[PDB]
């Protein structure tokens, strides 16, 4: 009942931060400034958890192929898990929004057990900032916002979801079981014509996830 | 606040609703019929022992379904901790059968969105779906995007429920059910904002 | 390696032993007489539901005590997760009564030190006392710390055993044991201008859960 | 059930490191060199947990009075908790060993709720390296012992002692994450495998954590 994923590998793993930038036309200081806050913030938090943070964006069409191909194919046998953070903007013209759906399909697709043997039995954690339906065994999908739900909008200090996620990560990252921590993020954000933003997470993990130190 | 829990100290635990999807299904082998009864009877035992008022019905009763569905949605849940709904279904699934189910679940879940149900605002709404959101919702799926003694998922869920139901945090328990079944891949989507225990 | 737990997956959970210290107590109001049974009966319910083979005796039966004591000591615990011992006693405590108790606990605890009991080596030995003895993998729980006030026995049992059992029933299966004992510390220390503060000394090397 | 001590104060608190030196005659390089390892090591670990580490020894008989009373009387209202580490040597002539018992009595005595209102309801954590008896207490006290009763103690090396080496090892790695007693148990296993069996006596009423600030 208390079984945990075995996190005792040489390397924690790769924390991948994907930035969705292309097909977004017109970007206020806030969108531009707030995205950096999120990326820079996440990198700090995920590094302190022992991840090899790697960041890129889809603007570099040539660079994206090599980097995407490099990560998918690299061997994760010495690693505990895999993390991917998909960041995106609020305005979202339709091509922008639509591209995102396709990018996430493909991204998630690379690591399904069939494509990635090094990660079989290991946690694959996708953290999505929306502008869903995919999966495999040992996948964890975390959404900035559930269905049809209102979204926080990007501030110059980053977005609510990423701000809070990182807040919790710094404080409780090492101590708490991950889903336990995500639930905290649910409550944190949902409390930030008025209603609420309610994040979600879909778990196909089969055990507990802790990020104790090393 | 990290260990904050939903407040389960109400007069009544709540209604465990077991919905049986039967209509638009044809040629049901005895494994189908007796297996389904195993699931329903099993779930009722487990959920009652957790203090739920188990209520069962099926969609064959077209006249009975409206009144009953109607009854539950409108009833006041202010004295209750949470709400549970189990959607049971069969494997063969002709297309009308499969399609009906999608619609039944939409509607069912729809009734309890905070908007429609004030008594349950801030309280857990737990939907357990056998395949063929809002704040404080918990969706559990027999299978992700993928027997005469009942089905694997319901058999294991109930197994875990009996053993660890009172002790464990619910999602902690569901994860156990993920491992259990995947070794005979279920899923669960959580929009809960706190911990869920079903202490006595 | 931080979340390591004692392995509780044996055929039998183990023996929960309830020792009743009765001899050399002259007296015994209805409350002491009645409250002790509450504690024993209560503890038996709670410890059985955790899978223990509860065994009760008292030191009045001087002949029966020897056979029962060494017998528990000598029996093989290889199929068992752990061992529990509850030492119950009264409040008035003339000096011979109080002194006898010290000696009974020494001896009791002594039987299970790894040297005497190979079946329990590496396994939790939990003594609940109603001091300084020990060994590796021992857990000592005291009704009251040093020099502190004690509950007094009511007709419904004592504060410490009432609360311990309360927590045991509710959180016994869920919680790590020491996590649970700490709850008992807070529970009892708030019962009511005197304060009773329980204690527990841990030489456990891992976590203790009593999952079903 | 998951209630925790409130660690959200302005200051974490004072980590006090008391060094028992007097009445110890003749001290090998290892005892001398190993004690500094322990003190220096503990200071690093306890500072990173936000403590105001203060060290002194009983050699300075004049300095000890001022420093001891000073700490006792200072106001801890802006603090989460209190820590005290009692360090000592292995050879231990009888006057040395006996003095220690008395020093610990007094030390612990200062912070009992009656003497110290600023700490009422707050954790008082005493970590003792042993050479009158073990047990003293009050509500919300946590007593940690290098070694249980009569059991073997594993001697001071030039790199410090086993207990302090391991305690600090765990502190650095798990100090912020884990509930303290959860962490001390880890120290029990760590040292007992280097038998030497540490102990801890808890009268804490809540959980625990030393999250950052």
Curated annotation (Swiss-Prot), chain B:
Phosphoserine PTM sites in chain numbering: 48, 182
**Mind telling me which InterPro entries this protein's record contains?**
Caspase-like_dom_sf, Caspase_cys_AS, Caspase_his_AS, Pept_C14, Pept_C14_caspase, Pept_C14_p10, Pept_C14_p20, Pept_C14A
Answer whether the UniProt record assigns the keyword Transport to this protein: no
- Map out region (Tri-arginine exosite) in residue numbers: 11-13
- On whether Acetylation is a keyword of this UniProt record, the answer is no
Modifications the protein undergoes after translation, according to the UniProt entry: Phosphorylated by NUAK1; phosphorylation inhibits self-activation. Phosphorylation at Ser-182 by AMP-activated protein kinase (PRKAA1 or PRKAA2) inhibits autocleavage, preventing caspase activation, thereby preventing hepatocyte apoptosis. Palmitoylation by ZDHHC17 blocks dimerization and subsequent activation, leading to inhibit the cysteine protease activity.
Q: What is known of its domains?
A: The N-terminal disordered prodomain is required to prevent self-activation.
Task: Tell me which UniProt keywords the record has, alphabetically.
Answer: Apoptosis, Autocatalytic cleavage, Cytoplasm, Hydrolase, Lipoprotein, Nucleus, Palmitate, Phosphoprotein, Protease, Thiol protease, Zymogen
**From which source organism is this entry?**
Homo sapiens
Tell me the GO molecular function terms: cysteine-type endopeptidase activity; cysteine-type peptidase activity; identical protein binding
Can you tell me which residues form the catalytic site?
Answer: 90, 132
- List the protein's name: Caspase-6
Q: What is the effect of changing residue 182 to D?
A: Phospho-mimetic mutant; prevents caspase-6 autoactivation
Q: Which reaction does it catalyse?
A: Strict requirement for Asp at position P1 and has a preferred cleavage sequence of Val-Glu-His-Asp-|-
Homology family: Belongs to the peptidase C14A family.
